[PDB]
A paper describes a structure:
PldA, a phospholipase D (PLD) effector, catalyzes hydrolysis of the phosphodiester bonds of glycerophospholipids—the main component of cell membranes—and assists the invasion of the opportunistic pathogen Pseudomonas aeruginosa. As a cognate immunity protein, PA3488 can inhibit the activity of PldA to avoid self-toxicity. PldA is mainly composed of 27 α-helices, 25 β-strands, twelve 310 helices, and many loops, folding into three regions: the core catalytic domain (CCD, aa 24–935), the peripheral helical domain (PD, aa 215–441 + aa 647–721), and a small C-terminal domain (CTD, aa 936–1094). Compared to the open conformation exhibited by PldAFL (pre-open state), PldAtruncate presents a highly open conformation (open state) and the PA3488-inhibited PldA reveals an almost closed conformation (pre-closed state).
Here, we have determined, for the first time, the crystal structure of the full-length eukaryotic-like PldA (PldAFL) in the apo state. Close examination indicates that the reactive His167–His855 pair resides in the loop connecting β4–β5 of the HKD1 domain and β17–β18 of the HKD2 domain, spatially in the vicinity of catalytic Lys169 and Lys857, respectively. Moreover, the imidazole group of His855 from the HKD2 subdomain, mediated by two water molecules (W1 and W2), indirectly forms a three-hydrogen-bond network with the His167–Lys169–Asp184 pair, thus stabilizing the active site. The conformation of the active site region is almost identical to that in eukaryotic PLDs rather than prokaryotic PLDs, indicating a eukaryotic-like catalytically active PLD conformation of PldA. In PldA, the main chain carbonyl oxygen of Ile1072 forms a hydrogen bond to the side chain of Arg876 from the α24 helix, which is adjacent to the conserved HKD domain. The B factor (The scores are negatively correlated with the stability of one structure) of the PD region is extremely high, suggesting that this region is structurally dynamic; in line with this observation, molecular dynamics simulations of PldAFL showed that the positions of these helices fluctuate. In PldAFL, the α11 helix stacks against the α4 and α9 helices, and these two helices clamp the α3 helix connected to the lid region, thus stabilizing its conformation. In PldAFL, the lid region forms a short 310 helix (residues 120–122), packing with the β2-α2 loop and the α8 helix. In such case, the lid region is positioned distant from the entrance of the active-site pocket, which becomes accessible to the solvent so that the substrate can gain access. Our structures of PldAFL and the existing hPLD structures show that they adopt an “open” conformation, with the potential lid region draping away from the active site and allowing the accessibility of the active site to the solvent and the substrate.
Author numbering: 24 to 238, 328 to 342, 346 to 396, 417 to 983, 993 to 1074
Amino acid sequence: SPCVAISAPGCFIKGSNLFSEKRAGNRVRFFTTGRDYFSDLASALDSASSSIFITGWQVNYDVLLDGRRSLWQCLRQALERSPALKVYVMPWLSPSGSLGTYDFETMLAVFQLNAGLEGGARAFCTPAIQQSDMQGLGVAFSHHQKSVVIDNRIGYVGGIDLAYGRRDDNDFSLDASGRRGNDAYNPGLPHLGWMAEDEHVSSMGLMMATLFDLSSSIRAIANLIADNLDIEPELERRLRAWLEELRTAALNLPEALRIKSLLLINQWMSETELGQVLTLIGSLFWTLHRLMQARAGGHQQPYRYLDEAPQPLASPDNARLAADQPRMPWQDVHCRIEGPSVYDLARNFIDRWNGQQAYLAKTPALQDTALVRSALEAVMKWLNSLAAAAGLENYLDEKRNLRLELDPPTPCWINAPEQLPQEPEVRRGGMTVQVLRSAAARMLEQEQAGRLGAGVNLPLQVGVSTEGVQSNCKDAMLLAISGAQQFIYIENQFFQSEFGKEGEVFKDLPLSGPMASLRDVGSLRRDFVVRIRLEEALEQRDLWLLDWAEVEKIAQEPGTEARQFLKSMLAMWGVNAQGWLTHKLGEAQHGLLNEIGEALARRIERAIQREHPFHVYLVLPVHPEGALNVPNIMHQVHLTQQSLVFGEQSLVKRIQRQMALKALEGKSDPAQAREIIERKDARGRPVYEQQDWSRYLTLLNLRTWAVLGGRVVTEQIYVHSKLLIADDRVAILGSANINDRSLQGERDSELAVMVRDSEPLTVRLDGKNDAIVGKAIHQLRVNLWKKHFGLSQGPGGFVKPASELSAYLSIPAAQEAWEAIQTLAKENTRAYERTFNFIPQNISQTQLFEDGFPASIWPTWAYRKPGELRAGGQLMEPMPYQEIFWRSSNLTSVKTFPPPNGVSGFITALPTSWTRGERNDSGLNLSILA
């Protein structure tokens, strides 16, 4: 019975900003591997006969779905099979190609789906502009939903984008050598191998096959700005004199020349509309979009390297992981839904699509159209010059006499009855599903305008809202947390949640040693810094104010220190400058806003008060995907550790204070009790820190290791899931991270489902007392635990199965279960740390403080002076984000590592002391990181 019935109060969310109401009668299939979701999707695309809707934060056309065909090939085969079928692809329109989503390339690939299709175009791609309420900071926000709907009858939703690196299985293999192109995925490592140019498609190759029917960089960028220059009259004159100076420069440019080049180039890419399009590679973009869509659609056949000879997309520099370099394994959860709630998934896609169409199709003012037209001629001047240089001049000549292409961005509505879903009849039984959104007030307004423009008003349930911010994902998590009776299991990419005041940062250390090395001018060599007047140029936020005469003399100064200084100085400038920009774009919040951490602690506090058992499992990534020496990554780690342990009102401290206060219950009245528990102990720590919070909370990371190319290697298993289970009775699955960006509702858009199974299963969650739970929810958690314990892998692993834990799979609320899980995780971590000093961990192994010195954000870092921590420091041994970790240099040789001994399962302990004392503040606007 517990929450089984559809009238049961407190089981699904209600209130004033619902995207949907719960519906019974669904069939849900859960995917616990990306391989299984992609394989299931390929099969469903092979059945599609009417419509295919795809939206995602990242959509990569060349990703293999079924081991043989790309997403693109599966879409093309469906269009050829079903003459009435239409395809719509809505990837997030990222503001920079540097985010690695490749939406621009996928867009061109989608255009090619129409090449040679009998009849008109039936494949459409509209990349989706963020519709947040964050005003000037909107550029930092995204559409983060991951959803696919086929024939308005099969709906997919969860955390898995159709993207590089997402496909993976129960082996979490580190070998990347069989992955194709960018699907060999590890953003934290330098990529020291080569993608052969004749086996990979370049973006330019793809553009060239879009425009025509084919069936150092400083001097390079300079000669490009030259041809399109003949712009604010001041920048023109600097660019006038700049070009003349290059024409007489030496093969090796003077340093002052080489830096004012990158200042002038950076001004061009950011200020003029032409360079603004290349950084995306304005309504210039949409006019280009229409032109390219129309050209590709007239071609006789799709580009050969999409279909006849499918090759992966290359990376921008054709670098890839070398044979000895590990991929980063991908942990994620997704599902497939059939039944009434597919209607709500279809409604999300259709209303979003039509809202984007209404937005982009608005007519500009004549003076704006005149600027877009002018920039388009140049953009088409640039693209046509590359084509000439690529030996495609004959294709250029054949188009000389055609009509000037400038058709207006026109709305492509989804409004034919065949593409629209039918309002479902009420059902009973099966799975009850409620579709949840995070969506900004601005988003809902554009959706209303798309309903008006397309003439589409899909019937809504009563009490569904079409106005105001939707924060359904946060509200459903809060409901599940407060309603939980025995335990909660959470997998999430993030734990960033309101934690009170920042805590534990060492006095006399305004910035951590590592962060100061990236941000703080006082960490550079002072004699070079004072000579070029760097400090003062930073104070006035203008790099032109350096003493360029001293810049060139240091540039010639022989040895190591002088060549290095200018490099680090310029990198520091960029970090500082990004900090200044993000604070100018919009107001910064103070601290984190979402209350997930408080709500988990509040539920544990109730257990403490009642003297009842309760437990929360949190499974999180070791650290955000990417390299640990990137400031925004370092800052997210900082906020994670504050949210979990170091903040004054962190999850662990909220729990410990409540345990301490209960120990004093009756003995003392309040107010005084709150002061007695703060009294500092022998080592200077508040006495409530003696409370064993591990009775209530287990924190886990995932890790594996292998011998790759004759070398011992390790990598985090990236927990990308966004999954919450309570009591094996409800699952919340979707795209919403535990951070402000996902949960507040007015920032990134998100999509999720709350699922309950009406099919009962009798279990003993705590090992003793019978409980009726949801059969498929229970099975989902059991499958995830089998996977993380190493019980689902095939033969030939380096990590053994943790078969000692199979006894606990069905009793997650038993104290014996979490105690066994904690013990094995701690033992795995000890085995890893015996050989790897560079992984996140509690105690520094290189600094050589009763337990020792806490390990730094860069674990091989040591501070020069324990007394004056602001004296700086250095990496004592390489970090994996460095090339010398992987490849010998003239003075260093590649260090090796003994294999870990005794690791069973992939679970490891989250290091609750990692970075204690360090303020890893990137200087970026906290609202962008929150």
